Enzyme design. Structure first.
Site, PDB file in Angstrom:
ATOM      1  N   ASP A 138      45.657  42.326  42.610  1.00 51.15           N
ATOM      2  CA  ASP A 138      44.769  42.340  41.449  1.00 51.15           C
ATOM      3  C   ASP A 138      45.030  43.530  40.520  1.00 51.15           C
ATOM      4  O   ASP A 138      44.102  44.061  39.902  1.00 51.15           O
ATOM      5  CB  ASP A 138      43.268  42.234  41.843  1.00 51.15           C
ATOM      6  CG  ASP A 138      42.395  41.691  40.711  1.00 51.15           C
ATOM      7  OD1 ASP A 138      41.154  41.763  40.828  1.00 51.15           O
ATOM      8  OD2 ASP A 138      42.962  41.234  39.679  1.00 51.15           O
ATOM      9  N   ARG A 142      42.148  46.860  33.778  1.00 49.93           N
ATOM     10  CA  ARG A 142      40.727  46.908  34.171  1.00 49.93           C
ATOM     11  C   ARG A 142      40.536  47.584  35.541  1.00 49.93           C
ATOM     12  O   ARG A 142      39.454  48.093  35.803  1.00 49.93           O
ATOM     13  CB  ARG A 142      40.085  45.486  34.193  1.00 49.93           C
ATOM     14  CG  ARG A 142      40.661  44.560  35.261  1.00 49.93           C
ATOM     15  CD  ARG A 142      40.051  43.156  35.311  1.00 49.93           C
ATOM     16  NE  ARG A 142      41.134  42.170  35.360  1.00 49.93           N
ATOM     17  CZ  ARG A 142      41.679  41.702  36.476  1.00 49.93           C
ATOM     18  NH1 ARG A 142      41.209  42.074  37.656  1.00 49.93           N
ATOM     19  NH2 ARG A 142      42.695  40.857  36.421  1.00 49.93           N
ATOM     20  N   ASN A 143      41.578  47.572  36.414  1.00 45.43           N
ATOM     21  CA  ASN A 143      41.497  48.129  37.771  1.00 45.43           C
ATOM     22  C   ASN A 143      42.222  49.454  37.931  1.00 45.43           C
ATOM     23  O   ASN A 143      42.504  49.886  39.052  1.00 45.43           O
ATOM     24  CB  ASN A 143      41.947  47.098  38.815  1.00 45.43           C
ATOM     25  CG  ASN A 143      41.062  45.889  38.826  1.00 45.43           C
ATOM     26  OD1 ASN A 143      39.859  45.968  38.594  1.00 45.43           O
ATOM     27  ND2 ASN A 143      41.631  44.741  39.086  1.00 45.43           N
ATOM     28  N   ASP A 156      39.972  48.819  43.129  1.00 42.77           N
ATOM     29  CA  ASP A 156      39.560  47.430  43.292  1.00 42.77           C
ATOM     30  C   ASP A 156      40.442  46.731  44.315  1.00 42.77           C
ATOM     31  O   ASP A 156      41.347  45.957  43.981  1.00 42.77           O
ATOM     32  CB  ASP A 156      39.468  46.677  41.940  1.00 42.77           C
ATOM     33  CG  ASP A 156      38.420  45.582  41.930  1.00 42.77           C
ATOM     34  OD1 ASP A 156      38.334  44.832  42.929  1.00 42.77           O
ATOM     35  OD2 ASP A 156      37.675  45.482  40.928  1.00 42.77           O
TER      36      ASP A 156
HETATM   37  C1  LIG Z   1      33.960  45.451  41.342  1.00 41.52           C
HETATM   38  O1  LIG Z   1      33.926  46.624  42.161  1.00 41.52           O
HETATM   39  C2  LIG Z   1      34.821  47.655  41.739  1.00 41.52           C
HETATM   40  C3  LIG Z   1      35.369  48.359  42.999  1.00 41.52           C
HETATM   41  C4  LIG Z   1      36.253  49.558  42.606  1.00 41.52           C
HETATM   42  N1  LIG Z   1      35.541  50.434  41.646  1.00 41.52           N
HETATM   43  C5  LIG Z   1      35.716  51.824  41.679  1.00 41.52           C
HETATM   44  N2  LIG Z   1      36.552  52.409  42.542  1.00 41.52           N
HETATM   45  C6  LIG Z   1      36.662  53.735  42.621  1.00 41.52           C
HETATM   46  C7  LIG Z   1      35.902  54.551  41.794  1.00 41.52           C
HETATM   47  C8  LIG Z   1      35.020  53.915  40.906  1.00 41.52           C
HETATM   48  N3  LIG Z   1      34.219  54.684  40.083  1.00 41.52           N
HETATM   49  C9  LIG Z   1      33.799  54.430  38.779  1.00 41.52           C
HETATM   50  C10 LIG Z   1      33.727  53.149  38.225  1.00 41.52           C
HETATM   51  C11 LIG Z   1      33.269  53.020  36.907  1.00 41.52           C
HETATM   52  C12 LIG Z   1      32.880  54.196  36.212  1.00 41.52           C
HETATM   53  C13 LIG Z   1      32.953  55.432  36.847  1.00 41.52           C
HETATM   54  N4  LIG Z   1      33.401  55.498  38.086  1.00 41.52           N
HETATM   55  N5  LIG Z   1      32.473  53.815  34.985  1.00 41.52           N
HETATM   56  C14 LIG Z   1      32.554  52.526  34.865  1.00 41.52           C
HETATM   57  C15 LIG Z   1      32.151  51.774  33.613  1.00 41.52           C
HETATM   58  C16 LIG Z   1      31.492  52.668  32.559  1.00 41.52           C
HETATM   59  O2  LIG Z   1      33.335  51.226  33.059  1.00 41.52           O
HETATM   60  N6  LIG Z   1      33.088  51.981  36.013  1.00 41.52           N
HETATM   61  C17 LIG Z   1      33.338  50.547  36.258  1.00 41.52           C
HETATM   62  C18 LIG Z   1      34.787  50.156  36.596  1.00 41.52           C
HETATM   63  C19 LIG Z   1      32.252  49.918  37.124  1.00 41.52           C
HETATM   64  F1  LIG Z   1      32.306  50.402  38.420  1.00 41.52           F
HETATM   65  F2  LIG Z   1      31.004  50.229  36.587  1.00 41.52           F
HETATM   66  F3  LIG Z   1      32.417  48.540  37.153  1.00 41.52           F
HETATM   67  N7  LIG Z   1      34.944  52.585  40.901  1.00 41.52           N
HETATM   68  C20 LIG Z   1      34.992  49.804  40.421  1.00 41.52           C
HETATM   69  C21 LIG Z   1      34.061  48.646  40.825  1.00 41.52           C
HETATM   70  F4  LIG Z   1      32.975  49.151  41.550  1.00 41.52           F
END
Ligand SMILES: CO[C@@H]1CCN(c2nccc(Nc3cc4c(cn3)nc([C@@H](C)O)n4[C@@H](C)C(F)(F)F)n2)C[C@@H]1F
Length: 297
Positions: A138, A142-143, A156
């Site tokens: 994936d 976006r990831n 992700d």
């Molecule tokens: C669908 O699950 C995925 C799993 C992986 N993930 C992830 N992994 C590592 C760190 C992290 N932190 C992380 C994710 C963040 C963020 C700050 N820190 N700000 C955003 C918004 C404003 O853009 N996001 C996205 C991608 C959100 F998570 F809200 F969707 N986020 C993002 C998300 F939780």
């Protein structure tokens, strides 16, 4: 026959962390910006908390397994899990959000140096996943998340193993074949997204028409900023023969040579006169705050 996975799964108490605000929401649940304040440690770690039926719990625990098993500067690792009525994943706060929204919003201040460096970092992260025998399945802009404008990480792991049609290799769409070489295809699509400042690949074309379009030999167009040097790399990532595609280790080398003289490889108006936030700026970053990368128990 295959090495024991000795990664530690840290179980965190709910009382140890606080939710500040919502960062994102989907069918999976909601992601919160928060602070993790461990035991009697005198540290505040900025975190992203992914909060969540039996199948949804199995899928979040599968992603937790993979995410707790990675350790690289260019990949997002799981800090821990909280076992409440709803299972929560505790991850590092990536304060500039995803790279896709970042290239769309900061397009007027993104120079060739940042773009080529992001390509090197993604290839480094992907080469690490390959060393770990992990197929992402994936990879997309976006990831890829932004810790700072100069430091990005792949995340992700919801599809990672030992449907995003427009980022998939032809073998994957047609036969469900996934390899490190099918991730290289997705890498090429990710690079295209960065070079076009977040354009949607094959915009307007429905996913069912993509396999046919690829079979004829149609590929994503040459972005206006890309020299033939950069585009030829993207095109090699989209070859029919998986083994003919570059390896992540070669992509690191190629993009690194380009990052040494960036203006020779990407043509951007006003490049070098562009400014993005850095940890050497006023009010860039509140007492005892430590980034997850420096919190090492
Ligand atoms: C669908 O699950 C995925 C799993 C992986 N993930 C992830 N992994 C590592 C760190 C992290 N932190 C992380 C994710 C963040 C963020 C700050 N820190 N700000 C955003 C918004 C404003 O853009 N996001 C996205 C991608 C959100 F998570 F809200 F969707 N986020 C993002 C998300 F939780």
């Amino acid at each position: 026959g295959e090495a024991p996975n000795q990664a530690l799964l840290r179980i965190l108490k709910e009382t140890e962390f606080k939710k500040i605000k919502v960062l994102g929401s989907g069918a999976f649940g909601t992601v919160y910006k928060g602070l993790w304040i461990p035991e009697g440690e005198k540290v505040k770690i900025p975190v992203a908390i992914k909060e969540l039926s039996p199948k949804a719990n199995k899928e979040i625990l599968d992603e937790a397994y993979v995410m707790a098993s990675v350790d690289n500067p260019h990949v997002c690792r799981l800090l821990g899990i909280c076992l409440t009525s709803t299972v929560q994943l505790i991850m590092q706060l990536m304060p500039f959000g995803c790279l896709l929204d970042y290239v769309r919003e900061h397009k007027d201040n993104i120079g060739s140096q940042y773009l080529l460096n992001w390509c090197v970092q993604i290839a480094k992260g992907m080469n690490y996943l390959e060393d770990r025998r992990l197929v992402h399945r994936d990879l997309a802009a976006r990831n890829v998340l932004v810790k700072t404008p100069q430091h990005v990480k792949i995340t992700d792991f919801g599809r990672a193993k030992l449907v995003p049609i427009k980022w998939m290799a032809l073998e994957s769409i047609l036969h469900r074949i996934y390899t490190h070489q099918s991730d290289v295809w997705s890498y090429g699509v990710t690079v295209w997204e960065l070079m076009t400042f977040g354009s949607k690949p094959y915009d307007g074309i429905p996913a069912s028409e993509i396999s046919s379009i690829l079979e004829k030999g149609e590929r994503l167009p040459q972005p206006p900023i890309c020299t033939i040097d950069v585009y030829m790399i993207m095109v090699k990532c989209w070859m029919i023969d998986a083994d003919s595609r570059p390896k992540f280790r070669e992509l690191i080398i190629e993009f690194s040579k380009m990052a040494r003289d960036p203006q020779r490889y990407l043509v951007i108006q006003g490049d070098e006169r562009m400014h993005l936030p850095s940890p050497t700026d006023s009010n860039f970053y509140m007492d005892d705050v430590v980034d997850a990368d420096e919190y090492l128990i």
